[PDB]
């Protein structure tokens, strides 16, 4: 038994020795080089804000650390120890890594023209970028999926994110806003820096009107800070530095409140309207959302669609859910057309509490 006993003890020995070696190491202050002075003096600013002139430990290949490069200054002498790659904020990391479920284009109904416009803007320019060169244009960069609530804008964005390969950055415009000074604009700058670093990229901003609202001439300090964020965003899209292979998608249901500079054709090139489902769109959505429901009758989807006038995709999904609710309440392990009719009338009654939904840009 001593063999295995001492083997495990030696494994724990290696672990503990590694732990002690780590324990005998101290951290280093990350800054960015500003300029090189005399081959041994570098003006470096620590991220905390102070600026110093510091030395450089020898094996650093001074050519590798140029103005703007992240470096690790020693915590005591502040001398450079190693150059680092550009930082990726934890926010931008999780933005890139959010899971858009596994939504497929087969889960979206009436949106066919809109789907192909979005794909025209996103996919083809990033896969065959020479057709547009031949025709003599620079393919559109920005999309505005605007429409009434629950018409499928976020579902379409999720489908695109799941079904395309290029890098994708998920973000709700209200989850960029921070109370610190300049933090939101800095976060947007880091978004676009990450996008440029990973050149084939898409940036989806859900409910953009959180940030991209109209600019107030009499707003508060908070409004002015959010407007600074908006203007940083506008400069990033169509400012001095051109954007290559980075596309923007922005979803909204109050496009009338967006800044005209944001709605400008140069920034949000193609504004596509995810309108309320028409007759055929309602039929398609109802089939999509009633496919998995165990129906045991003859379903006049046409009648359901006729009574579903003015509904949205979420309303039709709720029609299916309410038919199921009626089934359980009746203690039935299936659904029928009487249940579907009751559900659609219930949702129609619920729709009476809404307000204006036909909001358009410009």
């Amino acid at each position: 038994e001593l063999r295995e006993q001492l083997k495990e003890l030696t494994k724990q020995y290696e672990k503990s020795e590694n732990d002690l070696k780590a324990l005998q190491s101290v951290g280093q202050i990350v800054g960015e080089v500003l300029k090189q002075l005399t081959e041994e003096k570098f003006i470096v600013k620590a991220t905390n804000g102070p600026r110093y002139v510091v030395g450089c430990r020898r094996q650093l290949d001074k050519s590798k650390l140029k103005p703007g490069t992240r470096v690790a200054l020693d915590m005591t002498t502040l001398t450079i120890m190693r150059y680092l790659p550009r930082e990726v904020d934890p926010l931008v990391y999780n933005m890139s890594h959010e899971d858009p479920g596994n939504v497929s284009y087969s889960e979206i109904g009436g949106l066919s023209e809109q789907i192909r416009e979005l794909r025209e803007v996103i996919e083809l320019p990033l896969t065959n970028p020479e057709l547009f060169q031949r025709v003599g244009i620079i393919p559109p960069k920005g999309c505005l999926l605007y429409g009434p609530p629950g018409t499928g804008k976020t579902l379409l964005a999720r489908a695109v994110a799941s079904q395309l390969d290029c890098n994708f950055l998920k973000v709700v415009s209200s989850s960029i806003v921070d109370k610190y000074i300049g933090e939101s604009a800095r976060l947007i700058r880091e978004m676009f820096n990450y996008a440029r670093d990973h050149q084939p990229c898409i940036i989806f901003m859900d409910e953009i009107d959180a940030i991209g609202g109209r600019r107030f001439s009499e707003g508060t300090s908070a409004d002015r800070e959010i407007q600074r964020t908006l203007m940083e965003l506008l400069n990033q899209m169509d400012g001095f530095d051109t954007l290559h292979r980075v596309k923007m998608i922005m979803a909204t249901n109050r496009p009338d409140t967006l800044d005209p500079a944001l709605l400008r054709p140069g920034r949000l090139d193609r504004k596509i309207h995810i309108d309320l489902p028409n007759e055929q769109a309602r039929l398609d959505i109802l089939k999509i959302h009633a496919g998995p429901i165990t129906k045991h009758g003859e379903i006049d989807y046409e009648a359901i669609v006729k009574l579903s006038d003015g509904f949205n995709g979420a309303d039709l999904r709720n029609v299916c859910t309410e038919a199921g609710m009626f089934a359980i309440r009746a203690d039935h392990d299936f659904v029928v057309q009487e249940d579907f009719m009751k559900a659609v009338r219930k949702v129609a009654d619920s729709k009476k509490l809404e307000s204006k939904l036909d909001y358009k840009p410009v």
Binding site: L20, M75, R317
Partner: protein, 203 residues
């Protein structure tokens, strides 16, 4: 020398830690780019006493004050405002204490409780349970009373937000409050979130 190695490790790992984040995890051998609550970004050539493959950008860690070496991984941050708005001492109001509300109860109870306990009905019928229940009512009736009864009779994680609690200055706040509330409800076992006086926030 396991004993003495652990002794030295404990001496270095004595409290108090400084809680920082793991904003970036670089490969060079793995290194950290932590940012500490003193608002100071420190690059750690050696991550420390916690496994490298257990840290992801943004998670909360404990760090040595001087060496700034990661020592522990700490739970997620929930504003003490989003923890203080969780129901611990459950209300006590049986549905029998409710008056002329029977259909309204039945409807709520269904949409909320049934997907929690009898999810098998939903799964076998191939349905997505109803998501949100909005209780409109004139200034009277039994909206908050029924919410109290549900929280008392549910035996789940109940989180009473109220409306004007989520409206704050310091732009970003309020949104952070909502995000933290929903994240806490998600991490906890099946949970309800009660928005009292929704029109304060949903205008």
């Amino acid at each position: 020398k396991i004993k003495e190695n652990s002794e030295k490790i404990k001496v270095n790992k004595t409290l108090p830690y400084l809680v920082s984040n793991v904003i970036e995890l670089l490969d060079v051998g793995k290194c950290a780019v932590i940012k500490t609550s003193t608002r100071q970004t420190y690059f750690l050539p050696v991550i420390g006493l916690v496994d490298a493959e257990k840290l992801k950008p943004g998670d909360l860690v404990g760090v040595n004050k001087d060496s700034y070496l990661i020592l522990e991984t700490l739970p997620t941050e929930y504003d003490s405002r989003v923890k203080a708005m969780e129901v611990d001492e459950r209300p006590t109001e049986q549905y029998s204490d409710i008056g002329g509300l029977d259909k309204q109860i039945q409807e709520l109870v269904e949409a909320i409780v049934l997907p929690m306990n009898h999810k098998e009905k939903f799964e076998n019928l191939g349905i997505q349970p109803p998501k949100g229940v909005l209780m409109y009512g004139p200034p009277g009736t039994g909206k908050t009373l029924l919410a109290r009864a549900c929280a008392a009779q549910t035996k789940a994680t109940f989180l009473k937000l109220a409306g004007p609690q989520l409206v704050q200055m310091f732009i970003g706040d309020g949104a952070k409050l909502v995000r933290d509330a929903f994240a806490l409800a998600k991490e906890k076992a099946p949970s309800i979130i009660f928005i009292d006086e929704l029109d304060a926030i949903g205008t």
